[PDB]
Design a protein around this ligand. Structure first.
Ligand SMILES: NCc1[nH]cc(CCC(=O)O)c1CC(=O)O
Ligand SMILES: NCc1[nH]cc(CCC(=O)O)c1CC(=O)O
Ligand SMILES: NCc1[nH]cc(CCC(=O)O)c1CC(=O)O
Ligand SMILES: NCc1[nH]cc(CCC(=O)O)c1CC(=O)O
Ligand SMILES: NCc1[nH]cc(CCC(=O)O)c1CC(=O)O
Ligand SMILES: [Cl-]
Ligand SMILES: [Cl-]
Ligand SMILES: [Cl-]
Ligand SMILES: [Cl-]
Ligand SMILES: [Cl-]
Ligand SMILES: [Cl-]
Ligand SMILES: [Cl-]
Ligand SMILES: [Cl-]
Ligand SMILES: [Cl-]
Ligand SMILES: [Cl-]
Ligand SMILES: [Mg+2]
Ligand SMILES: [Mg+2]
Ligand SMILES: [Mg+2]
Ligand SMILES: [Mg+2]
Ligand SMILES: [Mg+2]
Lengths: 352, 352, 352, 352, 352
């Protein structure tokens, strides 16, 4: 057979290469560790509403629709842990929503005020605002829906997204994040931004955004579910498709985007890796609302250890090729990191 | 002409892609930072001699030939800042050197004793021991020199390198590092280790090791300069060649090496990168004694800032593809990182 | 065990391939040597000021702020050893610097006069003039600094660099070398040049120029250190990044550059090799002032041998993929080569 | 149409890229020159015979069947110009030729005595000896011919080639060069050498040797033409095939060869470049007798300029991926280079 | 040892793959033959002058400056062997040559007259006409020379080339072949031809044409040698360079070229293969005059067999990746195949 004995009579498989040697102990694993997670690689998305008091999002346990005041307190808490990049979503008062979504470019709207207020209080902090009409749409769609046809009209939607993007830019958004999946919108937004003097303002293109069923809880957060049994499969991508992602990614880099987003997250790590291999831009992954609920719900019932699994997920995103990760665990992960770094350092060390 | 004007009359260059946007401020740079340095990715190389007192190495300013107790002191200090991996080189009494280099496999010799001593005191230290005859050679060559011909005899050298390797493994070296550039030694050493039951002991292969003039100060530290005008050009690689390195790398992986080393360092970052692309093994680079002497010399004269350049150098090794770097600055770099992290955290943060 | 005996009973490792055979002696090493350095692949960078007398640069020993007369002497000595290409930097009087850096396009300024003077004295000399405002900027930045934000404003800076490039081209510069890292400057300069009839004038694009700490001695030479504790990280590249280098290189190619420069040098050989692999343009590398200081520092203390290490360094740039290398050792290298060829030919031979 | 006018009414074609800028003058062309020729990359192939006087080979104008003493004079002359590698072929007395070709391994044969005489007169000289039976074959074929079938029997031939290689090695041949194109002979020869203690002796594998009509003049030189209107198409390669060359080249590399030869030369540059791209071994090309004759014929008639064309030829081999070139012009090329380098330096410069 | 014995005791090397098995006999070699040559892949370049009698070109033996009469007899004889493509070059009366080369665009010039009369005589013939100024230049340059600088001025030259191509296209040329190596001229000629309604006329772009010393005899044929010791190195490519070739090929593809030409031939087969590999356009190689002269010279002197060598060369061109080959042996080669086909069929067979 294949087994021999060694000089001392012990069983010996004479294989030369032994991969387990590089797993021998922590010091060796650390020497060869290929990927690292840090707090300033995490994006923390928050929800603000135009009310006096915060309200839990029951389907996103531990996250809330924050008042302006609790928004400031939350950003400040996250910075104390080394989070620097924040994503802002508004739960718009229902009376303001419409088919055309004109509230999206109202300079006195909730979102611009919040950006203005976070910036006054934390001038060095980094603000990403979503560009898309669904939070402002009475139909629950990211673009304008045609009365007669029911189609999400591409080009008319882009005209609007441009107006929103400039408003957010002017309020102080560092980065606008078109999550709308309309054809051609990166270039259009880019040109408008630039004509207005906002050449500094970045675009995080949602390039490869799938028509997922993992967005449930975010739509609760925003009360932004689609009306009347309609879906977004005429604009968000078919999860059956990878090749198509290259089509979209190539188009967004050449239209001027600063970073590409892949969304959702863990169930699309293959797409993340594929675009990362081909793109020369930074990549961002979005650990979406549904993915967060899955973790919390299993953690709440004791099925998994919350801390170990969240840290494993973030390392995975990072291994799969994400330069940054938008995650509702952003604050909690940084906190765990800073507490270990201050305690016994069971799993952390410094980096630069 | 190529300049236009924007909506407010200001000068406007109508380019879409603006890479500067991803450099806008520290928060964004961190979001998109592709490579990180951590202390546990640094290997600290140290010199021990058999004297009661430590002696400086004038051409490696700040480094010494260490007495056994100062070696323990120095490993302790580096550990406290998070260095986990230590390379050990013996400065051997000139009485014990010879043609065949017998002292190399003496189990009562200095290096085995040092290994055991450090293992008693710091059990979870990773100890890397050099395998090569030049510290023990009366000719100052890494292999056995023929009397009549002057050739470094490959296969007789490899016999000897097996004898040394086993000795160090038994002493407690976690990893042996053949620095000899004889042909076929990785496979031969591996098999001898395994036959003796040392299947756990790792080989860090000096695969792409060049006939460099950046090693002089190390040779000062060991008093190991080549006898009688000769050189190592018959075994170490011509710096003119890159294609040859792929030949060495491929052979060492199939011979069962656990990690591959490229040395010297900065002046070979292209070979490091080439082999990183091709290899599936972890890569190590060596920032050699000559390279250390250059930074140090210019720092003492005031020409460069020591901290900034050293930290840039280490980020470079890591960008180029080093999973780990051997550098005489390892202790000092970890010390800076740990101090910043305890202070203002001007340039570090936690990772995992 | 693996060791066998040959037919004469001598120790034999039965490996077939043996890379050491192609290292046997100088003659075989020469047959298989993949890279060669020649003087006409070196670019010699010099500093000129408007004073009667030359003044040494203490942090770049051997190099001086040259008077116009001594500039001509120095170019002449370098020509005689085979250097054909010379890069010129002006130390400008503090009184002519300003925020808009308008002295940069003054056709009676020091640099244009230096170019005209060198052209009258050696009509076939190859001159490469830097494009960038920092030698003329009272802020020590490569672009115009906005009063209110402190941002280095991109497009207005490009307009200035276009004027600068035209002035230098008109003065007789063979190549303009924009080292500014503004977005889009290559194409803008190209079109400006072409509209003025200077379609012959080349552009050496600094594509991958890093926010390095090795530029210090250069900034002593020009007295052009950044004001107020500011840095250049909003435009020079993060050393942590390689993928970004490809974004920059591909864009300068398609904007019409004739050559691509990676800078700094030895610590960026990985970026140099990667861009070499992907570009169809000639590559240039810059062995920068800080790198020069390190070598000198070490050589002066006797830690290394100056000649050996300089000659290996130059071979390394070349193996890594540099068609040309800009280096303050250019004259000295050529001299060594010419002395060896005129003498005993210990290391040189003819090529074509 | 496509033409516009610049700022001064001059015709202007607004193309951004102008490759001609990199051709502007000699200095620019030298900056970007991809390939260089040097004498120590040339192999000079020579003919010796066992007679008192030398005799021209009329179909190779300017080369001769050298007497032993003239062989020495010629090697000496070629060394003084920097040639280091010499290929040696015996024109064997016809009374010693045979079917078994046993004179190929006579240790008192002309080739072995030629090697010993050269190795005694020029100890640092590099000698390459052909391994093949055709110089000793009374039928003029590279291997043993079967009486009944007329097939060249492969393995029997390899057995004889091993005998021949050992003889040449023992006589002092630095490289043996099997030119036979039997299958498997690289591995057989390697192993036969190693067993005899000749692990130093190199193998220059003729991997891609084509059944060419360009060997005529060489066959005149050795009087080694095939009998009975036969050919070598059952062993040498069909010139119609390129894929096949990869199969050949892979086998020889894994059989242990030190370098790979493609032959003939210029009409197989495509093959040379292909194996250069896919091989990690040093490449050699053979500028064969027939190609030499074509250059000499045309120069003698005044149709071409000998010197210009030969020099362009060696540059082409070298651009196509040859590390070394076997050429009957080797001495004359070195001489032109040395004369230029000592004289006007119109086309040469020093390298290392 | 390496050899063993088969079941009858015969010497046997136990190698599994044997490449000679696919060379066993003509039937097998034919089965696996990767490349074929046919007459309709050959282009026959001819010379016409405006005299009553044809005149031998002594440096291209067997080729002549043909009278119009004799030009029609030669195309007929070649069409009778299967050649369908002809290249036409005019020797111009020295009285009509200018600095501006206006005769190039004369619709009553020799060349337009050759074209029209060949189309009248054979409508099914494919005529390729050169586009370049050198047959018409009093300086012997492919472009207009500035009296003041001596530079071949690119854009003004392209203006002229467009006029010539329009002229030759109206005359009936199926294909114009810009051999001039000015930058951008393929695009410019294409748009010009198009605006005149010559959308059907093809452009074979001399993409990678090198500054070669193999053009001598063609320049004899036309009496077109460069005046006053000048060269074409500021537009034709440096033979030292291959990467540059990719850059020219990419540009000409993207400017609308139908086919791409590499020139010269055999000594550039590496460039031919690389371009073949990257390009999606048909490739043409030019076996230039100097190459022809070398074959003829050696053949006349009896050093090589003309027929075997020529046929081998053409097969090589095709293996290297030539879809078509311009060669002065086109008629002679086609005649050899036809004769073998109509005869005893030693080396040809039918194809489609
Ligand atoms: N265009 C809006 C938007 N931006 C972010 C998310 C989902 C984020 C999450 O689930 O956490 C969505 C919802 C959707 O498009 O249906
Ligand atoms: N084979 C021994 C060895 N191990 C490391 C170095 C050099 C290390 C240094 O310069 O830091 C050397 C010397 C040499 O090979 O000449
Ligand atoms: N654009 C300015 C310039 N041009 C070249 C150098 C540095 C060269 C060296 O260090 O030798 C610099 C300084 C900088 O940009 O910070
Ligand atoms: N196998 C022997 C041998 N070695 C080199 C050549 C030819 C070299 C030349 O033509 O210059 C030949 C002849 C052949 O194989 O037919
Ligand atoms: N552009 C002119 C032209 N077209 C074809 C040839 C050469 C053809 C031959 O050598 O057979 C030349 C000469 C040159 O460019 O100098
Ligand atoms: Cl912090
Ligand atoms: Cl963990
Ligand atoms: Cl910007
Ligand atoms: Cl830093
Ligand atoms: Cl030009
Ligand atoms: Cl050297
Ligand atoms: Cl010499
Ligand atoms: Cl030449
Ligand atoms: Cl067979
Ligand atoms: Cl044939
Ligand atoms: Mg899209
Ligand atoms: Mg090795
Ligand atoms: Mg750029
Ligand atoms: Mg073979
Ligand atoms: Mg071109």
């Amino acid at each position: 057979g294949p087994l021999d004995n060694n000089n001392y009579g012990e069983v010996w498989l004479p294989i030369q290469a032994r991969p387990r040697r590089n797993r021998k102990n922590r010091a060796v694993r650390q020497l060869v560790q290929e990927n690292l997670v840090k707090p300033s690689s995490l994006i923390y998305p928050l929800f603000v509403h135009d009310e006096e008091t915060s309200v839990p999002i029951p389907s996103m346990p531990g996250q809330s629709r924050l008042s302006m005041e609790d928004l400031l307190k939350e950003v400040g808490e996250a910075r104390s842990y080394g989070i620097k990049a924040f994503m802002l979503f508004p739960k718009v008062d229902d009376e303001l929503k419409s088919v055309m979504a004109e509230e999206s470019y109202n300079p006195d709207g909730l979102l611009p005020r919040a950006i203005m207020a976070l910036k006054e209080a934390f001038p060095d902090v980094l603000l990403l605002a979503d560009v898309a009409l669904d939070p402002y749409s009475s139909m629950g769609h990211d673009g304008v829906v045609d009365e007669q046809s029911g189609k999400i009209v591409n080009d008319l939607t882009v005209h609007q997204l441009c107006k929103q993007a400039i408003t957010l830019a002017r309020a102080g958004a560092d980065m606008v994040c078109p999550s709308d999946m309309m054809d051609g919108r990166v270039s259009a937004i880019r040109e408008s931004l630039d004509m207005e003097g906002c050449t500094d303002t970045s675009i995080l293109a949602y390039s490869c955004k799938y028509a997922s069923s993992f967005y449930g809880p975010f739509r609760d957060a925003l009360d932004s579910h689609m009306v009347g049994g309609t879906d977004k499969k005429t604009y968000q991508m078919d999860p059956s498709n990878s090749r198509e992602a290259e089509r979209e990614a190539e188009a967004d880099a050449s239209e001027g985007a600063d970073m590409l987003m892949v969304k959702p997250g863990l169930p699309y790590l293959d797409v993340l890796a594929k675009i990362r291999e081909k793109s020369k831009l930074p990549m961002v992954a979005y650990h979406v609302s549904g993915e967060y609920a899955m973790l919390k719900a299993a953690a709440e019932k004791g099925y998994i250890s919350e801390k170990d699994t969240v840290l494993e997920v973030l390392k995975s995103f990072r291994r799969a090729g994400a330069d940054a990760v938008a995650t509702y665990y952003a604050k909690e992960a940084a906190k765990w990191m800073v507490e270990d770094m201050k305690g016994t350092q069971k799993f952390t060390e410094p980096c630069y």
